[PDB]
Design a protein around this ligand. Sequence first.
Ligand code: COH
Ligand code: COH
Ligand SMILES: *[C@@H]1O[C@H](CO)[C@@H](O[C@@H]2O[C@H](CO)[C@@H](O[C@@H]3O[C@H](CO)[C@@H](O)[C@H](O)[C@@H]3O)[C@H](O)[C@H]2NC(C)=O)[C@H](O)[C@H]1NC(C)=O
Ligand SMILES: *[C@@H]1O[C@@H](CO)[C@@H](O[C@@H]2O[C@H](CO)[C@@H](O)[C@H](O)[C@H]2NC(C)=O)[C@H](O)[C@H]1NC(C)=O
Ligand SMILES: *[C@@H]1O[C@H](CO)[C@@H](O[C@@H]2O[C@H](CO)[C@@H](O)[C@H](O)[C@H]2NC(C)=O)[C@H](O)[C@H]1NC(C)=O
Ligand SMILES: *[C@@H]1O[C@H](CO)[C@@H](O[C@@H]2O[C@H](CO)[C@@H](O)[C@H](O)[C@H]2NC(C)=O)[C@H](O)[C@H]1NC(C)=O
Ligand SMILES: CCCCC/C=C\C/C=C\C/C=C\C/C=C\CCCC(=O)OC[C@@H](O)CO
Ligand SMILES: CCCCC/C=C\C/C=C\C/C=C\C/C=C\CCCC(=O)OC[C@@H](O)CO
Ligand SMILES: CCCCCCCCO[C@@H]1O[C@H](CO)[C@@H](O)[C@H](O)[C@H]1O
Ligand SMILES: *[C@@H]1O[C@H](CO)[C@@H](O)[C@H](O)[C@H]1NC(C)=O
Ligand SMILES: *[C@@H]1O[C@H](CO)[C@@H](O)[C@H](O)[C@H]1NC(C)=O
Lengths: 552, 551
Amino acid sequence: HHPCCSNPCQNRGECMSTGFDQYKCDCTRTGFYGENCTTPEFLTRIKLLLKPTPNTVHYILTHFKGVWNIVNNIPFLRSLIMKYVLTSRSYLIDSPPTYNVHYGYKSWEAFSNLSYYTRALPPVADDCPTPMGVKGNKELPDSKEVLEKVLLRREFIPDPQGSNMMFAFFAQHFTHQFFKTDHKRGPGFTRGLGHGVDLNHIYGETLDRQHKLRLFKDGKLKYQVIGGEVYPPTVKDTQVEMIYPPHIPENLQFAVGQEVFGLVPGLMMYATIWLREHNRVCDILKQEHPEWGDEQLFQTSRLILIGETIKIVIEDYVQHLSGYHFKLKFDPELLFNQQFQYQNRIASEFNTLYHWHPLLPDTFNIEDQEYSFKQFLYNNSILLEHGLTQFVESFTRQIAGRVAGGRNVPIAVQAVAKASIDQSREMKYQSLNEYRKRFSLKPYTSFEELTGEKEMAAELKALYSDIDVMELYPALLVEKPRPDAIFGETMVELGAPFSLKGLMGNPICSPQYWKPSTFGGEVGFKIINTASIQSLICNNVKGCPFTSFNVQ
Amino acid sequence: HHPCCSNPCQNRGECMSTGFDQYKCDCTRTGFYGENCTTPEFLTRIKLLLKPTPNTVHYILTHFKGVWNIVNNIPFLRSLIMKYVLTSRSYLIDSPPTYNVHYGYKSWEAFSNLSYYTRALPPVADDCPTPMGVKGNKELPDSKEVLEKVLLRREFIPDPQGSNMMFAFFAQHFTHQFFKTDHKRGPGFTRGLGHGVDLNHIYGETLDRQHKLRLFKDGKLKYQVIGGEVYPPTVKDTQVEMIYPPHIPENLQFAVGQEVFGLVPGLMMYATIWLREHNRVCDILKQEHPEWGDEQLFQTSRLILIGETIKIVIEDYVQHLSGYHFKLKFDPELLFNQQFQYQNRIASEFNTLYHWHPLLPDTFNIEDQEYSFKQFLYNNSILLEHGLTQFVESFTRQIAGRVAGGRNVPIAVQAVAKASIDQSREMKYQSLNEYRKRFSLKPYTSFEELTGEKEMAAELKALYSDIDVMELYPALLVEKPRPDAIFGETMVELGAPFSLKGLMGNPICSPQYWKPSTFGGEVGFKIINTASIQSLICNNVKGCPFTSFNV
Ligand code: COH
Ligand code: COH
Ligand SMILES: *[C@@H]1O[C@H](CO)[C@@H](O[C@@H]2O[C@H](CO)[C@@H](O[C@@H]3O[C@H](CO)[C@@H](O)[C@H](O)[C@@H]3O)[C@H](O)[C@H]2NC(C)=O)[C@H](O)[C@H]1NC(C)=O
Ligand SMILES: *[C@@H]1O[C@@H](CO)[C@@H](O[C@@H]2O[C@H](CO)[C@@H](O)[C@H](O)[C@H]2NC(C)=O)[C@H](O)[C@H]1NC(C)=O
Ligand SMILES: *[C@@H]1O[C@H](CO)[C@@H](O[C@@H]2O[C@H](CO)[C@@H](O)[C@H](O)[C@H]2NC(C)=O)[C@H](O)[C@H]1NC(C)=O
Ligand SMILES: *[C@@H]1O[C@H](CO)[C@@H](O[C@@H]2O[C@H](CO)[C@@H](O)[C@H](O)[C@H]2NC(C)=O)[C@H](O)[C@H]1NC(C)=O
Ligand SMILES: CCCCC/C=C\C/C=C\C/C=C\C/C=C\CCCC(=O)OC[C@@H](O)CO
Ligand SMILES: CCCCC/C=C\C/C=C\C/C=C\C/C=C\CCCC(=O)OC[C@@H](O)CO
Ligand SMILES: CCCCCCCCO[C@@H]1O[C@H](CO)[C@@H](O)[C@H](O)[C@H]1O
Ligand SMILES: *[C@@H]1O[C@H](CO)[C@@H](O)[C@H](O)[C@H]1NC(C)=O
Ligand SMILES: *[C@@H]1O[C@H](CO)[C@@H](O)[C@H](O)[C@H]1NC(C)=O
């Protein structure tokens, strides 16, 4: 078998076979040397001693509110801290990207083929004696068993950070522009060839789809007006293909950028909000530029909405998730004097960590009604009956489920959660602890250490036998959460670098793009730099209801 | 008309309409301010005062040979100078890329759509009163008249730098991996979706084409043996589509990565040389790694050949072109502490400036034979008849033509030269002087200043009227060359920044790729770092004939 099966090379050292039973580690620029890149250079040894743990940093960022209240209001200090936040997390992602599901070594095919999700860790070789390499049993434990014992919801566990349904549905809507698995090809392939925040979920992945969605007047997107309210246009009207069961009435077959968004009225709520936002921005730009044609109006609005999206994701969405007292800032200028690659490739493991199905409640509570999953799925009449104002008011008040902590996946989506495990194994994912080391985390030494608890830990111990073969995905959902937090350490420390790269890597954040003229002048630039989840709703939802990402 | 038609914004300021007849200049980060971004900030004043001209820098690099001989043998100083060369060129190219033929403003379509060549300068708006904006006449001069008067060869003018046919065909073979105009869509579109040095011209643009070209044994490419010599396989054998005239016999239809390389036996020479090199590298890697399968042998060999290519282009090819006494270095590590984007998008203007058709001789001289264009084109019999050794020997001896200085385009390719002009206009290219300003060069104040001469200048004046509407492409071919040089200032100062990006931007140059293990270990890595045009020919051509890009 492949001599690199045991993952012998440490500290980002790269393993290469040198014969049938021999390997070599390439310790280039790791700061380590020796056979397995485990002997530190002198300068490295000092860095390890001085470097605080992620849990220490988290404590600092989530306490001392009085000090942070000062920091947040001194623009120079806020910028400095944010510059550190950005740069401390940038160096962890290979960019240009490296591995994929089919390539455990660098290749032009893995680099150039945009149809693959990239990989933070190479896959376990095909001929390895065990699934995780050389450790553990010949087979991993039954996935249905892992699911049932440590993942499935017994009783609803609310998120102690107060994440609501506005947050949960924003998470789903936003990420589904860049997690678009091409199931025809396999779980390691994507349909989102832009590999990031291009807003294809609004505009369509292809030019063909985009042009079917466009009005070709005033830069705008096509729409319909039902009971005086603006909604996306129909499949019939546009000839835009969507996923709908046959029994859905023509009028409720809404056509949007992303073909799966009719699945859930919560997704269609945001699809509608963003459609309205695009047309609103077209109006503003038309007022600024009566001389502009439809094409420039459309394209400039798209760039503005991309900017709005990144602004909101950083300052509201990630801000909420983090639990930080420090106020995160979207400011591309923070990177202009730094080394940073303005490019991104979506990582398979980023997809996997983002399977936050515990967020989902047992019922979807809108106005006085409580809808089951079966009543909610593919049911856009709910959206029409209640309207966007009530959707916002209800979803703002309804708490979401805790993701870490174990036993909180609703049974309605048990098959989805089982698929995350099954596809991970199919894609030959390395273990949790290999991923922990990859992102500069200390490997867990027991199951009890992972869960911070005894019962699930014992179940997992009997299932997996060795902590070193525990799998990434289920570990994320059973991990001991940070104090009163939605996530444990592994989720934050893997998710943050992937996220940073997707957000700041966007070409609009690059110096040649980050200019008023790119966005139609100061007015368009202003729309980006003042965007918030609240203003998004305020501008595009009747009555400007209050909203936020927490129930509070 | 569009208020930005006059190109009012200077020093990289972006122009935006603010009404039907008003514009505004966005002067962000230009180091200038005011209505047209022409008032320099204080730091900029000092920078401009201390900045040497490209002509001055060129003088220093092409003189003081003895000092450069010393400098070349001190690794720290060579690295420091090469680093400067790389970083001074870098800031000139938009990366991520911005404009294209259809987009004079930044847009997601322009950024994301890889089918377009990018544009260093936005197209002139469709409604502008004149082709160049507002200056000049309603129509540009007849492209035939421009061609006949100042571009077409009378007497053959040899390149004073001594460029040979090895160089001329290398230029053609190398660049045609990334200049692959999609003529079905238009001149602003490309089929080279990798936008750089990916060696699709050897391996094929698509996976389907690559798989037809591969042996699937030992990582190797399919090949045939003719008279004991290795050549590319046939169209009939691979089912790989190639562009050939119908009369070309099946045995003479070689199948290689790039569809058009059957056009010219000089191209098929390099196609054969590089095919052999791939298979040679496969042999070496199999010795290093008996445990590896076909897929990894193939992929790692491709990576090594990409490295060899960049190595040769910098240290032999650009080295020869530059005329520098300073020895250029291929070293990715020079950029590791620098701000640099490991990405590239091929510019239309880079394509345009690289139409070096004056390089071509009147006849192609192989051994005792002199082949006209008619006899040479599409004639791979010539390659088989003489063999690669005689091709190398002959092409190394034969001098190429001077590109700048005017009147050196061979008649045989007059329609191609006329197309470069016509397609520039179709693509709504801004003027020569606009491109000079875009690249920190002083606008020419007269046609005499451009040519360094009187006869052609007076013909151009009669044709164009105003120096500020002189077109880019004809300008490059008539420009006063540097002393005893192949090119004028405009060619080098536009070409070098596009070139640097395409070469150093390659992902193999990034810190996570630039490691021995990427290339199968130290042996594979050394193949790259010791590559040369001479070694390429020595290892792959019977008899190891001597070669270089000069003489
Ligand atoms: C971010 C949180 C989140 C939420 C709240 C959520 C809410 C819901 C929900 C009810 C609202 C239902 C019925 C489902 C059901 C599914 N989810 Co999500 N999903 C979420 C994150 C994801 C992600 C990420 C994927 C992978 C998408 C991919 O790879 O294409 C996913 C995939 C799926 C899939 C299969 C992949 C596909 O292409 O569709 C189903 C079925 N699901 N999920
Ligand atoms: C690098 C120097 C070089 C050389 C030595 C060379 C040698 C030769 C040669 C004799 C061997 C012949 C018969 C041709 C003939 C042609 N060349 Co060149 N070409 C060269 C640089 C280019 C470039 C660059 C293009 C544009 C390629 C594209 O856009 O696809 C080109 C395009 C062409 C075209 C397409 C015309 C158009 O519309 O662009 C023809 C025909 N030609 N060329
Ligand atoms: C990016 O990578 C994927 C995965 O390798 C590529 O898709 C694959 O493409 C090949 C060749 O085009 C397909 O192979 C087959 O060829 C023959 C037809 O001659 C036939 O026997 C098979 O039915 C099939 O067509 C292969 O199916 C396909 N693999 C998939 C879909 O997983 C893709 O082409 C690459 N993208 C680019 C731009 O290169
Ligand atoms: C670096 O590599 C590892 C291999 O993972 C180690 O080899 C192992 O040493 C173990 C002792 O703790 C043995 O029990 C085990 O048999 C052995 N594995 C194999 C397959 O050789 C090397 O000793 C280590 N080298 C250094 C220099 O630290
Ligand atoms: C990149 O741009 C080109 C040109 O706009 C697109 O090609 C056109 O696509 C439309 C809609 O599919 C076709 O109707 C036209 O025939 C094409 N125009 C041509 C040939 O010039 C191309 O689709 C774009 N690429 C992507 C991936 O969106
Ligand atoms: C900025 O540029 C504009 C346009 O080039 C200048 O306006 C022109 O100036 C000339 C001479 O001053 C006049 O002949 C014309 O009235 C204008 N030209 C055009 C195209 O209409 C303006 O002077 C510049 N502004 C500054 C502050 O220097
Ligand atoms: C492309 C965006 C993806 C969605 C982003 C949201 C979550 C990412 C997924 C998992 C990570 C879990 C929590 C992230 C929130 C806070 C963690 C700290 C944020 C940080 O350090 O900077 C954050 C810094 O990177 C922001 O720039
Ligand atoms: C798209 C892929 C581009 C690969 C490059 C291929 C061809 C480009 C070669 C020449 C372009 C035309 C003129 C420049 C040539 C020589 C001038 C000197 C070069 C220099 O000073 O910097 C040298 C410094 O820039 C070295 O990088
Ligand atoms: C949705 C509820 C899960 C049903 C599947 C039961 C599979 C066995 O799972 C068991 O469930 C018990 C009850 O929570 C726990 O006490 C045990 O620790 C657990 O192993
Ligand atoms: C869909 O929602 C409506 C409320 O708008 C509800 O009355 C109906 O029963 C639901 N339909 C299905 C098929 O669940
Ligand atoms: C092709 O080259 C051969 C020499 O190998 C020559 O004799 C012949 O005339 C050429 N063919 C044509 C049609 O020009």
